[PDB]
Amino acid sequence: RSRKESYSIYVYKVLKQVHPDTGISSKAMGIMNSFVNDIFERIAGEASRLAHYNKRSTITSREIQTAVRLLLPGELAKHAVSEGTKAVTKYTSAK
């Protein structure tokens, strides 16, 4: 009778954002959940190692940026870094 964590709703929203006419299977949504969880864990763990290396005690957005630069390949890393930086800028200039 417990609740369960999922990224399915947001993956579905992004899919409707990028392909408003195509739906998604349930097996494929499970796959998308697994992919999002894996990338989340990779980036967070790399940022945690980065924090321990510099003896800092905080993951700021800078450790996330360095983890993305370390983990994603070239054009993917560039685009992801730009997306994140623009998102943080939009977040800050809205109080």
Binding site: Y7, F35, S57, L76, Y91
Partner: protein
């Protein structure tokens, strides 16, 4: 009077849930306030990219429902995404159509 951080950053992924996941998953004992925003942006970007490629590979095969095969195709056919997911097995996805030209008839 409560505007969610996902809207405040213009994202579709949950900034707050990501922040909680970072805090519980003990990566460091203190988590900045731009870390969840950045991470949610990155995850939503990568999701959107794979979903765009899978939607292309679904419209390619005259379908309106993405299945695991289309994700396999969208990943294994892209250089960057196949490098990111080199050691990832996808369930019920198969392999890419590929025959060595040595094995074909002359």
């Amino acid at each position: 009077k409560a505007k969610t951080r996902s809207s405040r950053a213009g994202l579709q992924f949950p900034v707050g849930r990501v922040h909680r996941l970072l805090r519980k998953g003990n990566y460091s004992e203190r988590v900045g306030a731009g870390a969840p925003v950045y991470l949610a942006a990155v995850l939503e970007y990568l999701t959107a990219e794979i979903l765009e490629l899978a939607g292309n590979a679904a419209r390619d095969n005259k379908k309106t429902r993405i299945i695991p095969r289309h994700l396999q195709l969208a990943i294994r056919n892209d250089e960057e995404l196949n490098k990111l997911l080199g050691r990832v097995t996808i369930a019920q996805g198969g392999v890419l159509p590929n025959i060595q030209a040595v094995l074909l008839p002359k």
